[PDB]
Amino acid sequence: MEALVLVGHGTRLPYSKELLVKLAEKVKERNLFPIVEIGLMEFSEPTIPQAVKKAIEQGAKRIIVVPVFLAHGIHTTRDIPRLLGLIEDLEIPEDVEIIYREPIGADDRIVDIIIDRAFGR
Amino acid sequence: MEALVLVGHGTRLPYSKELLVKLAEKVKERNLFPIVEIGLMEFSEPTIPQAVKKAIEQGAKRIIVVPVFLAHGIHTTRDIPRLLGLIEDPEDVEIIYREPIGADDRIVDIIIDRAFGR
Ligand code: NI
Ligand code: NI
């Protein structure tokens, strides 16, 4: 009844999509949501509309959209909210609700990661 | 003698630089490096060359550059390595260019928090 949709920037190089695919695989391993999907804003498929439509098709009535972005920017304030129909400019049903979440940000766990990377781990 | 340089994409909006500033401040609180600096690839100052120069001027001989990017892309494979002189097109100082964030189990943890509004 609820879906997690991870959305990323998307690049000409495949690394951005590969990242979202691995993250989605890890989320699915946690057994938290019946439905998990990825969408890329640009350059790659699935697109964000395709991901949300796929979640709706599988029976989700609550669509939790998480922007896999480090910081806010024009894509998280404008482009993605527009694709989701949350701001003026994908048909979302009446009984479906989009829950648009916050990006990663300066999380203490990002600091942990950065220190590992700094030491080659 | 060693510096941590965090580099980010940089945006017209201030949020990208503000992120890097907050991360560097948190790193400095860990008391791991003598010298900590940020640089933005585009749109903002400090630029990446400016960040590395400040680290060198403060006495660093080992400059660890960490790309605060989620995934590899043209900026981490070409643009930033070029700005760092690691590819075609510094002193007895050594640049150590590290890997981006990637699909870390801790990113999964963060994402789950964000999914639930935490
Ligand atoms: Ni962009
Ligand atoms: Ni770019």
Q: Write out the catalytic residue numbers of A.
A: 9
Contacts of B101 in chain A (CB under 8 A): 70, 110, 113-114, 117
Question: Do residues A19 and B70 touch, judged by C-beta distance below 8 A?
Answer: yes
**Partner-chain residue, chosen from B16, B71, B108, that has the shortest CB–CB distance to A16:** B71
Show the domains of chain A with their CATH numbers: 2-118 (3.40.50.1400)
What resolution in angstroms, rounded to 1 decimal? 2.1
CA angle in degrees (0–180, nearest 5) for B69-B72-B77: 110
Question: Which residues fall within 8 angstroms of residue A121, CB to CB, at 6 or more apart?
Answer: none
Distance from chain centroid for Cα B82: 15
Residues belonging to the binding site of B for Ni(2+) are 9, 75
Q: Please answer yes or no on whether B66 and A118 come within 8 Å at the CB atom.
A: yes
Q: Tell whether the torsion through CA atoms of A9, B51, B106 and A119 is positive or negative.
A: positive
- Rg of chain B in Å (alpha carbons): 15
CA dist A28 → A31, A35, B87 (Å): 5, 8, 39
CA separation for the pair A101, B118 (Å, rounded): 9
Taken in order A12, A14, A15, A20, the sign of the CA dihedral is positive
- All residues of chain A having their beta carbon less than 8 Å from the beta carbon of residue B70 are 8, 16, 19, 68-70, 104
**HSE of A28 in the Cβ direction (CA atoms, 13 Å)?**
12
Among candidate residues A78, A56, A74, A72, the one with its CA nearest the CA of residue B19: A72
List residues of chain B with CB under 8 Å from any CB of chain A.
4, 6, 8, 11-13, 15-16, 18-19, 22-23, 26-27, 30, 32, 64, 66, 68-74, 77, 98-112, 114-115, 117
For B15, which of A16, A30, A71 is closest by C-beta distance?
A71
Choose among B1, B20, B8: nearest CA to B63. B1
CA-closest candidate to residue B32, choices A121, A70, A116: A116
